[PDB]
Amino acid sequence: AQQGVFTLPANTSFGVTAFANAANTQTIQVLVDNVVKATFTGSGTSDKLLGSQVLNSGSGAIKIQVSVNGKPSDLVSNQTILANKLNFAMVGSEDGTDNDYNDGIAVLNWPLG
Amino acid sequence: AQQGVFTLPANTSFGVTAFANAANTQTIQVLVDNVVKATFTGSGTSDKLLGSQVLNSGSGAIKIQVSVNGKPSDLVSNQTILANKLNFAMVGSEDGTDNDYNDGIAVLNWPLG
Amino acid sequence: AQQGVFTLPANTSFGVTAFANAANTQTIQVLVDNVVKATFTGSGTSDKLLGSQVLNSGSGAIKIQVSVNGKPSDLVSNQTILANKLNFAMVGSEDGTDNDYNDGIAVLNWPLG
Amino acid sequence: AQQGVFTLPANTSFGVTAFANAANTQTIQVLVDNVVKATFTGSGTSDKLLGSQVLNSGSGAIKIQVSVNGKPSDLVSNQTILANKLNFAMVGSEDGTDNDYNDGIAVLNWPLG
Numbered sequence: 001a002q003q004g005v006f007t008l009p010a011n012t013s014f015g016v017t018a019f020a021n022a023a024n025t026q027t028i029q030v031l032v033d034n035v036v037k038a039t040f041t042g043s044g045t046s047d048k049l050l051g052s053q054v055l056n057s058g059s060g061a062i063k064i065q066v067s068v069n070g071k072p073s074d075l076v077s078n079q080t081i082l083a084n085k086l087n088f089a090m091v092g093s094e095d096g097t098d099n100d101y102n103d104g105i106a107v108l109n110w111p112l113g
Numbered sequence: 114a115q116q117g118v119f120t121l122p123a124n125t126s127f128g129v130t131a132f133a134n135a136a137n138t139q140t141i142q143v144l145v146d147n148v149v150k151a152t153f154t155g156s157g158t159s160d161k162l163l164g165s166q167v168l169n170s171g172s173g174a175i176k177i178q179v180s181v182n183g184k185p186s187d188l189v190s191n192q193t194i195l196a197n198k199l200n201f202a203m204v205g206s207e208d209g210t211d212n213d214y215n216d217g218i219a220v221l222n223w224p225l226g
Numbered sequence: 227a228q229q230g231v232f233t234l235p236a237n238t239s240f241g242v243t244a245f246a247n248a249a250n251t252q253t254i255q256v257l258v259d260n261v262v263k264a265t266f267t268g269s270g271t272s273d274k275l276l277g278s279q280v281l282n283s284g285s286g287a288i289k290i291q292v293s294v295n296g297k298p299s300d301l302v303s304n305q306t307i308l309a310n311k312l313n314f315a316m317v318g319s320e321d322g323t324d325n326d327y328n329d330g331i332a333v334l335n336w337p338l339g
Numbered sequence: 340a341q342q343g344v345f346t347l348p349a350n351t352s353f354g355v356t357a358f359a360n361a362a363n364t365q366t367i368q369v370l371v372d373n374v375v376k377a378t379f380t381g382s383g384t385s386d387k388l389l390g391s392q393v394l395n396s397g398s399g400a401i402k403i404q405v406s407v408n409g410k411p412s413d414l415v416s417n418q419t420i421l422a423n424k425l426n427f428a429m430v431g432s433e434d435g436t437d438n439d440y441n442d443g444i445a446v447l448n449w450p451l452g
């Protein structure tokens with residue numbers, strides 16, 4: 001299945017926060033309506049915080065991509081809703097063979113405010 | 114039900130990252146075996162990143178507390194596992210009456226490496 | 227926080243399946259726009275299947291209630307989305323003191339077809 | 340990523356419940372330590388309940404397979420934990436091209452009792 005693709009409510013601010021747990025440099029891109037709006041880059045094996053940004057969801061079509069030196073990683077994702085209000089969309093990824101799936105991570109949350 | 118309580122694997126590094134979406138100052142505490150090991154403090158209504166830290170899970174007993182000026186907030190939480198390997202534990206909280214449950218948020222992830 | 231409340235897409239068929247893991251008779255009600263549309267009743271401590279039904283979501287306002295002989299149980303819930311398409315909404319409940327939260331369970335899934 | 344694979348606690352009873360939302364006959368197998376312990380078979384496009392069974396988790400290694408006339412479907416899965424106690428493991432699958440991922444579904448829950 002396609003992973004890293006999420007439908008958000010339209011025209012809604014959301015936070016996205018990216019991490020590495022990898023020896024290799026991760027490139028984590030956040031696309032809104034197929035346009036890259038944020039890119040997070042780095043490495044480190046202890047939950048290196050690569051950055052956190054607030055973006056508008058546009059039509060609501062979000063796609064997260066993770067790659068290492070142009071090679072796409074294998075993604076896994078889901079979305080969970082707490083209290084029928086608080087949304088998290090999580091992306092992990094595997095750049096190698098150990099299948100820890102933590103190499104490049106994105107966490108999205110909404111609504112803000 | 115009790116919320117914000119999670120059983121992690123013992124003696125395992127995990128990341129915890131905290132956010133505010135609130136006018137009021139949030140105090141987000143991370144307890145490992147009933148001992149506060151990290152405290153994140155601040156306010157802001159656009160997913161203000163309060164900090165991110167890596168901690169050892171001790172016996173595995175983790176509890177997240179959120180309060181505003183000593184008054185405990187109402188918490189909501191869960192844990193989700195992707196690819197039978199990548200764990201996220203999420204905590205939201207409500208300090209008021211609008212029931213957005215985003216006022217003080219913690220996201221935990223493991224394993225690292 | 228309120229638990230057992232979910233916003234579904236409007237005018238959409240969904241499945242709801244109920245279980246007991248309890249010595250006491252569970253009453254599990256499914257409300258659509260505040261109207262009870264299904265009721266599941268029974269006991270048994272080995273995941274007794276109480277029934278499964280397909281309902282229309284109406285406006286999308288779903289609420290699950292669980293009670294034992296008229297006394298509301300303590301509910302816990304969330305919603306998770308797989309492949310940006312397949313939705314599950316889960317409800318557990320505690321009628322007593324052992325805090326297994328499995329006493330009366332509802333699982334909702336959509337879309338069908 | 341591998342999907343449909345879950346690590347349960349060892350020697351623990353769990354429930355598994357299977358559904359179809361498909362024109363084609365689904366075959367949903369539940370393996371415990373690589374041994375098929377339950378098989379659910381059928382079709383129907385309105386959340387047809389194919390069956391529900393309680394099994395022992397053995398070492399804890401569970402794998403769900405879904406196929407149509409011997410052809411493996413594309414699986415998606417995750418696991419979620421409520422109240423730090425109630426576990427659900429969900430599997431959806433796609434046998435075709437419409438990518439509804441609802442064609443053959445398994446829901447596992449534990450602990451029972």
Ligand SMILES: CO[C@H]1O[C@H](CO)[C@@H](O)[C@H](O)[C@@H]1O
Pocket residue numbers: 021022023024025045094095096097098099100103226
């Ligand atoms: C050296 O091992 C690490 O780095 C590689 C490459 O990034 C990852 O796949 C792996 O999980 C570890 O984090």
Ligand SMILES: CO[C@H]1O[C@H](CO)[C@@H](O)[C@H](O)[C@@H]1O
Pocket residue numbers: 113134135136137138158207208209210211212213216
């Ligand atoms: C002024 O409204 C905001 O601040 C209060 C108090 O922190 C929160 O409960 C609320 O959701 C908003 O974020």
Ligand SMILES: CO[C@H]1O[C@H](CO)[C@@H](O)[C@H](O)[C@@H]1O
Pocket residue numbers: 247248249250251271320321322323324325326329452
């Ligand atoms: C006798 O113990 C059982 O029944 C009670 C009452 O229903 C439940 O709370 C409990 O978890 C067990 O399933």
Ligand SMILES: CO[C@H]1O[C@H](CO)[C@@H](O)[C@H](O)[C@@H]1O
Pocket residue numbers: 339360361362363364384433434435436437438439442
């Ligand atoms: C005819 O369409 C249905 O049946 C096919 C084959 O099973 C599924 O893939 C599809 O989602 C529908 O449920």
Ligand SMILES: [Ca+2]
Pocket residue numbers: 093094095096097098099100101102103
């Ligand atoms: Ca890896």
Ligand SMILES: [Ca+2]
Pocket residue numbers: 021022100101102103225226
């Ligand atoms: Ca790694």
Ligand SMILES: [Ca+2]
Pocket residue numbers: 206207208209210211212213214215216
């Ligand atoms: Ca609030």
Ligand SMILES: [Ca+2]
Pocket residue numbers: 112113134135213214215216
């Ligand atoms: Ca808020």
Ligand SMILES: [Ca+2]
Pocket residue numbers: 319320321322323324325326327328329
């Ligand atoms: Ca109980």
Ligand SMILES: [Ca+2]
Pocket residue numbers: 247248326327328329451452
């Ligand atoms: Ca019980």
Ligand SMILES: [Ca+2]
Pocket residue numbers: 432433434435436437438439440441442
């Ligand atoms: Ca299909």
Ligand SMILES: [Ca+2]
Pocket residue numbers: 338339360361439440441442
């Ligand atoms: Ca289908």
